[PDB]
Symmetry: C3
Subunit: 491 residues, 3 copies
Amino acid sequence: NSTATLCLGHHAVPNGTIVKTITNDQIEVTNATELVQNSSIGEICDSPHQILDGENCTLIDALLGDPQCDGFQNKKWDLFVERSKAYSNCYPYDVPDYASLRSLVASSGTLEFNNESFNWTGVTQNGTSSACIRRSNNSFFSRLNWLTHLNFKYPALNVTMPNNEQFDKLYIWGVHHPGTDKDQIFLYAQSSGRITVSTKRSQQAVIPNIGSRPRIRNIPSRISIYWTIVKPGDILLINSTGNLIAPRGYFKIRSGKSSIMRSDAPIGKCNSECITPNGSIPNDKPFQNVNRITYGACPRYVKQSTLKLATGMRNVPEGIFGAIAGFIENGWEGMVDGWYGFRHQNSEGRGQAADLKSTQAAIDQINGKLNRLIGKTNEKFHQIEKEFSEVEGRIQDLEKYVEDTKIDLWSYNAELLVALENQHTIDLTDSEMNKLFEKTKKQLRENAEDMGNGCFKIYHKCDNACIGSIRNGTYDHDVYRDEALNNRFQI
Amino acid sequence: NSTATLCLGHHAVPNGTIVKTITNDQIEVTNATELVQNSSIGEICDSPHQILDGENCTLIDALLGDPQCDGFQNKKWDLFVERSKAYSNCYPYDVPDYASLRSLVASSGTLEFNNESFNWTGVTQNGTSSACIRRSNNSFFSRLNWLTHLNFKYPALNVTMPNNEQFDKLYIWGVHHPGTDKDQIFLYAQSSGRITVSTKRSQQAVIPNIGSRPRIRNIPSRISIYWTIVKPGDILLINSTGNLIAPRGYFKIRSGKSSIMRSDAPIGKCNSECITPNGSIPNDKPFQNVNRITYGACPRYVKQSTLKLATGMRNVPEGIFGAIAGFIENGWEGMVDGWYGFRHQNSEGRGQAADLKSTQAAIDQINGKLNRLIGKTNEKFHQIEKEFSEVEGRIQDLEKYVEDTKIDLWSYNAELLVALENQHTIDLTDSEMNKLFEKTKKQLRENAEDMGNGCFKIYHKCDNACIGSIRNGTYDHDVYRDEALNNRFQI
Amino acid sequence: NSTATLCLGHHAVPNGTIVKTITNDQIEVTNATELVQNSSIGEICDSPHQILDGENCTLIDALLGDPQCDGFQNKKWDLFVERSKAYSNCYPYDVPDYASLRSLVASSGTLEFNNESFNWTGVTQNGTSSACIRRSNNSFFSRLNWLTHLNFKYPALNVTMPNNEQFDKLYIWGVHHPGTDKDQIFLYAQSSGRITVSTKRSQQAVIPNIGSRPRIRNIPSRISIYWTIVKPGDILLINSTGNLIAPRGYFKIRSGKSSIMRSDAPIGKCNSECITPNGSIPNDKPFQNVNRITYGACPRYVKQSTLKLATGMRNVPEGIFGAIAGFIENGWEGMVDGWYGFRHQNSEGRGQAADLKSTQAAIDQINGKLNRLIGKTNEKFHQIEKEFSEVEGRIQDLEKYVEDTKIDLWSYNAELLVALENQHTIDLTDSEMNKLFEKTKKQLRENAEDMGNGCFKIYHKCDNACIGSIRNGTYDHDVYRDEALNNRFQI
Ligand SMILES: *[C@@H]1O[C@H](CO)[C@@H](O[C@@H]2O[C@H](CO)[C@@H](O)[C@H](O)[C@H]2NC(C)=O)[C@H](O)[C@H]1NC(C)=O
Ligand SMILES: *[C@@H]1O[C@H](CO)[C@@H](O[C@@H]2O[C@H](CO)[C@@H](O)[C@H](O)[C@H]2NC(C)=O)[C@H](O)[C@H]1NC(C)=O
Ligand SMILES: *[C@@H]1O[C@H](CO)[C@@H](O[C@@H]2O[C@H](CO)[C@@H](O)[C@H](O)[C@H]2NC(C)=O)[C@H](O)[C@H]1NC(C)=O
Ligand SMILES: *[C@@H]1O[C@H](CO)[C@@H](O)[C@H](O)[C@H]1NC(C)=O
Ligand SMILES: *[C@@H]1O[C@H](CO)[C@@H](O)[C@H](O)[C@H]1NC(C)=O
Ligand SMILES: *[C@@H]1O[C@H](CO)[C@@H](O)[C@H](O)[C@H]1NC(C)=O
Ligand SMILES: *[C@@H]1O[C@H](CO)[C@@H](O)[C@H](O)[C@H]1NC(C)=O
Ligand SMILES: *[C@@H]1O[C@H](CO)[C@@H](O)[C@H](O)[C@H]1NC(C)=O
Ligand SMILES: *[C@@H]1O[C@H](CO)[C@@H](O)[C@H](O)[C@H]1NC(C)=O
Ligand SMILES: *[C@@H]1O[C@H](CO)[C@@H](O)[C@H](O)[C@H]1NC(C)=O
Ligand SMILES: *[C@@H]1O[C@H](CO)[C@@H](O)[C@H](O)[C@H]1NC(C)=O
Ligand SMILES: *[C@@H]1O[C@H](CO)[C@@H](O)[C@H](O)[C@H]1NC(C)=O
Ligand SMILES: *[C@@H]1O[C@H](CO)[C@@H](O)[C@H](O)[C@H]1NC(C)=O
Ligand SMILES: *[C@@H]1O[C@H](CO)[C@@H](O)[C@H](O)[C@H]1NC(C)=O
Ligand SMILES: *[C@@H]1O[C@H](CO)[C@@H](O)[C@H](O)[C@H]1NC(C)=O
Ligand SMILES: *[C@@H]1O[C@H](CO)[C@@H](O)[C@H](O)[C@H]1NC(C)=O
Ligand SMILES: *[C@@H]1O[C@H](CO)[C@@H](O)[C@H](O)[C@H]1NC(C)=O
Ligand SMILES: *[C@@H]1O[C@H](CO)[C@@H](O)[C@H](O)[C@H]1NC(C)=O
Ligand SMILES: *[C@@H]1O[C@H](CO)[C@@H](O)[C@H](O)[C@H]1NC(C)=O
Ligand SMILES: *[C@@H]1O[C@H](CO)[C@@H](O)[C@H](O)[C@H]1NC(C)=O
Ligand SMILES: *[C@@H]1O[C@H](CO)[C@@H](O)[C@H](O)[C@H]1NC(C)=O
Ligand SMILES: *[C@@H]1O[C@H](CO)[C@@H](O)[C@H](O)[C@H]1NC(C)=O
Ligand SMILES: *[C@@H]1O[C@H](CO)[C@@H](O)[C@H](O)[C@H]1NC(C)=O
Ligand SMILES: *[C@@H]1O[C@H](CO)[C@@H](O)[C@H](O)[C@H]1NC(C)=O
């Protein structure tokens, strides 16, 4: 009682959180934050990306000009959304390398179309079908021109169209395969028919195949769709002796951030940068578990459902430096104004006071880690397909393997990052506690002794102002040294 | 001799192991474990994966029904093993996109076949050849039906088969290319021949090519093999005016964990989860150097032949805290009951005793690291091919580049992991030594002085029980303080 | 003045460098080195890789034997350089899967050609054109043999050539597509024409397409180029009823480190291991920002423009251990002979002296890090294409995605490496300072007190030799203990 006690300590909480570290699967810290986004609000926000809901139409149908898709003419988009309910209702068609055509249009991000005046002298234009009804009349694909005989003759066509513009042109055309030699005659007079479109660089030669296929909406015949790109200075050349489904012009083709996504999520009136087929997701977190398919500024897809980053010290209720969970037996739940602090007992009573500088030093370092991880996602746009409806073999094996490889490597990065940062966070918070203890020890010089539990026995009368002077670094040890030495060194 | 000495220390071994760290290429630790599996026992264990040894047959041969492969009918597998000795002994055939067909069947993991009654009215069935002898009789592929003329006519076929099941059907069929116009006539009457198989979604139109090719087992003619998948609600339609090698039914096609592997390793009667073409390998280690081609729960392939993870402290015979290989001059080889401990000299003699708590604290942290690395491999099944017998160009360049990219990234991860963990292991073991020293120092209060080499000069008579009380944390410094102070502070 | 002062400290510099760490975006260290190579000298060094400047010729042109490329006959290369100015000046041609042919030849790394004596009995050889003029005479591709009718007949060819060598043979051949039925007759007599080349394993059947295409240098007709590889024991078989552009022999095909690169950088007379299309770059740094396309022992391509690795301590003008930027208020700019040292004040004056052992300990650890990062790049040769002149869709999407995935993963590795190493460098340098302070403290025993700012108050007369004895570890505390204790413990 000619003595005082000053104890160093740290806070603790009743509701701790378990995190993983390098050396321990399960360690409790005072606070943590989740690094994996695991939920979507279920809506694709219409902002800030230009969304185009395909609704009942696929991109290719909107491209060809299925009557149902007339409203999509010349539209642009950042992201085209294809619905699973979509269906075609014009003339039955197939596209060799459908996936590539879908991909290049999606990436181009525009349906801008310019009509061109082709010289179809000698044939009937604007062929039409009951399989493709527009305004209650028999019709056809808006962007295609079905040519037939005129006066029972189909002269050999040799039609040309130069690109004298400064942009590429995307031409879509097709070949008709009648189900009977009869229909072939009726339509084109010729028995066979043959199509050949050329540029200076390319040749696409198609020979139609007369034959009945299983009926799609009662049609046993087909149209096969092809595309050719013509750059400035080049020339399109169309030779046909029949069966040619002619283009009415070209599509502008652009390069940019556009893409396409399969999803049944409704479009919402809201604003979110990251889109998944499940809906838009927040992008504050560096990782996400929602979908490997994404568009925009998105967290990276990982396999883990949760990854907790410690944002506080080890929680010790009741480190490499050995203070926290070390010579300091436990934390103080009653310290709610700081992370580290002092408890004292003197002549005037018992008190507690937080140390702000050490508290802030720990918090600044943790915020530095958070600044590296939170709100820094990277933009991805058009990628590769990652779900498949049909078996294809080799190329699909490769696309799947590439994505699986990527996810495992990011899942590894995420796992190690959290384990490493957490080990370091627990060590830096232990370090700050140790520094405060060491600083206090040096301050007291020969006037006190370390009791080994984070407490100092102070060998002199130390009232509240004296204790306060120690806490704020103005303690003058020389003032008390004589009193202290006499108390320490006696019998 | 009115004094005692208490020394803090750590163990050492005569047979140390060299490891790599962040700051040092070559540092000796007391113990380490290997992280790269570099050997196989040379056998593919038949458990716990269902192995199917192709022996003399390739998967495609077993699929088509080469007589040699009759025993493989309707078999399933987790892993099909193709031998380099395998050879075909039926009718000469090629498969366009052979690799894709092989891949999709392998992945399906079943040869389950259901016969279907096709209406081949107007043609001769069960065509047969001396190139494909079964039970000493001329025969053919068990799953294929060779159609020829009947009464010197081959009427146009238009055969249909609907899928009214709930599973997909895999149809295998082929086209015959006779080596002479003569054989073409003899077999099909028609001069040309043409095959066309269709679904609602697809058309495969093949025009046979009459001509002699270099003879395979004395046959200058060929059969080209094709496949079509028909989903529920869809319909197969076969038009042929000749040269059609007909299917006798369909294969069930499944999705699962099945795959195929090229290997000449014998099948063994044993149990191992990871299979490589070199044989099965243990999967206790996280990495392996045996083969980039694997199946099952396997360590990840890396380029390093060895990667040693330290599992003990730095070995100092004769860290950031500066105790081990620091102010403690060397380790104690004679300490074999613990990692850290005390050596003393007093009136009763000289002794040594291990400290169990600090020993266990270090061991627990190292075991925590091991638990993260040992026995946690990840299952891979069907992947991409990684060895190639023929030049292909673009697609093969891509498959090779993908695998090479993946291996370099995992080899990096493995290298950094070991360097980081080892640096940390050496630092945590140094830390535990420092904590024990600091704890002991505080215990002794004013009764001892640090001699600077991990030893304390104790300024009072301290018999064995006194030394023991220090080691077990029951030392009461107040008991000796007067004696100690008088000894310390004199002239 | 019956006392002395000994201060521990570290150096500082006026020109510090900002680096990134785990906990801080911007921290100043005494020195750093750049890890990202961002510049090229603009030349492709001709050493030590065998460079072949294509100049006006593409690889395929040199392969076919465009007259302009005669000088390239039988050349080999490690790297073939294609110029953007290159142009073809022989007969107009296209190659289906051009990219694959270009790739396999580039990778083979040789134009070694062996002539073979084919039996072209019944046809005219050495066909020739005004579209391909050699030495001012009408000519043709040096490696191809244009066959035409002889005496207005073109008999069915059935020509064979066995591979009885021990190496593979690469055969290049082609099909001619005349622009008129007239030219077809004039050249081959036959109305149609058909080509079929076979091996035991393969068949390539081409049917020429008569028709005019847009004129390339006034030619409306084309030659389509094909290749076939024939292994030892196999046989090439050529059937043609017309339009066959015949091979004159085979190319040797090798496997090795060769590749091809598009670049307009001049070839220089110098020596560099890493080549980019921008020019050769130094490979001392682990990363580079110059080009994702590389050949040789090259730093890895990353997205960051700069990544600074700290190679010195924190710069404090005017860590987890709390010495540097901690209880030591600031560094000493006047200490230029070491990183750590002593400053003293005694009866004889004030002095400064570096500590070499602690200085060297820090430097050795930093050099250990540098040794892991500097001068250890990995060799890559033939890879995948990474820039594209035409839209292709699916396969190109995959090639782009693979490269983008790889770069992001390496960019991550590089970012984390620097942040981690820098945090550790700052901590190890702080640690060395702390160790020196602790060692000095123990040396002084009871003869001095820690003033809390890295300085010791020494409680006895300590001349220059005495101070020197402390710095070199020969200080005998017992010599001064009586004097010191009397000074410390008084009133
Ligand atoms: C080839 O076979 C198919 C199947 O029998 C025929 O297609 C059917 O034709 C009938 C009437 O002609 C339709 O009512 C069916 O809906 C069709 N079925 C399918 C699946 O398309 C086809 O007519 C036959 N070809 C010829 C020329 O006879
Ligand atoms: C085309 O040429 C090949 C090679 O000369 C001929 O194939 C050979 O035919 C003979 C007997 O007819 C056999 O003994 C050889 O084994 C065959 N060689 C090969 C490599 O197949 C073929 O007959 C010729 N075509 C025609 C119709 O004459
Ligand atoms: C098909 O159309 C093209 C374009 O009109 C014709 O090619 C032109 O032919 C004339 C003279 O015959 C040349 O002067 C032009 O340079 C050619 N243009 C191009 C782009 O090639 C071609 O002649 C026509 N085909 C036929 C058989 O008449
Ligand atoms: C602990 O409780 C407080 C208030 O109830 C809350 O703010 C804090 O987030 C809780 N800790 C956690 C993360 O459970
Ligand atoms: C837990 O940590 C996060 C990130 O620092 C912070 O947003 C949250 O407020 C913290 N909770 C408490 C109780 O401090
Ligand atoms: C989509 O098609 C369905 C018919 O299945 C119809 O109910 C609906 O009106 C269509 N929506 C639009 C926008 O055309
Ligand atoms: C074909 O129809 C389009 C509108 O669909 C029209 O612009 C054009 O005049 C028609 N051409 C002929 C010859 O009927
Ligand atoms: C293909 O099948 C049907 C029925 O015979 C028909 O479309 C066509 O005539 C067939 N092909 C030939 C060459 O007869
Ligand atoms: C998102 O969709 C996928 C299926 O495409 C599903 O596996 C996953 O559970 C969904 N995620 C969430 C959080 O809804
Ligand atoms: C330090 O604490 C003492 C005691 O309360 C007080 O008198 C003084 O204002 C404080 N000094 C500073 C600089 O904060
Ligand atoms: C050292 O020797 C002992 C027994 O001979 C053995 O258990 C230990 O593994 C050895 N250390 C190594 C890894 O060489
Ligand atoms: C070396 O370390 C490994 C892993 O902890 C252990 O299995 C082995 O027993 C150790 N050897 C010795 C001598 O302790
Ligand atoms: C495999 O083929 C060889 C002939 O090369 C023969 O010796 C052996 O009997 C065959 N094995 C089986 C199981 O058919
Ligand atoms: C064809 O052979 C199979 C057995 O190989 C038999 O089931 C079928 O009855 C035969 N059909 C005819 C018409 O011979
Ligand atoms: C192809 O070559 C051989 C020999 O002439 C034969 O199979 C066939 O007759 C040839 N093709 C034609 C169209 O004659
Ligand atoms: C495994 O096989 C590969 C060849 O496929 C060979 O390069 C490697 O040396 C083998 N590994 C072992 C450990 O046998
Ligand atoms: C501590 O050591 C002393 C001396 O041997 C002994 O008397 C006592 O049993 C020990 N106490 C405990 C709690 O282990
Ligand atoms: C600081 O200046 C010296 C000499 O002027 C120079 O050697 C050193 O590199 C400079 N530091 C940096 C990296 O700016
Ligand atoms: C800075 O660090 C690098 C690498 O250690 C070294 O080359 C350079 O000389 C250093 N500069 C100074 C001023 O020491
Ligand atoms: C390359 O072609 C150009 C013509 O554009 C010519 O000036 C130059 O001589 C050619 N170079 C060589 C080496 O043939
Ligand atoms: C064809 O020309 C080549 C040289 O270009 C020559 O070696 C060969 O003798 C010629 N053959 C004939 C039949 O003219
Ligand atoms: C293709 O177009 C041109 C002009 O008619 C010509 O090359 C050829 O005659 C055409 N094809 C047919 C089958 O007439
Ligand atoms: C190298 O070339 C690429 C274009 O291929 C360009 O983007 C980049 O700026 C160039 N880098 C340097 C350092 O010249
Ligand atoms: C230590 O320093 C003292 C004082 O200068 C000097 O006498 C002696 O040579 C030094 N000893 C050693 C071993 O360097």
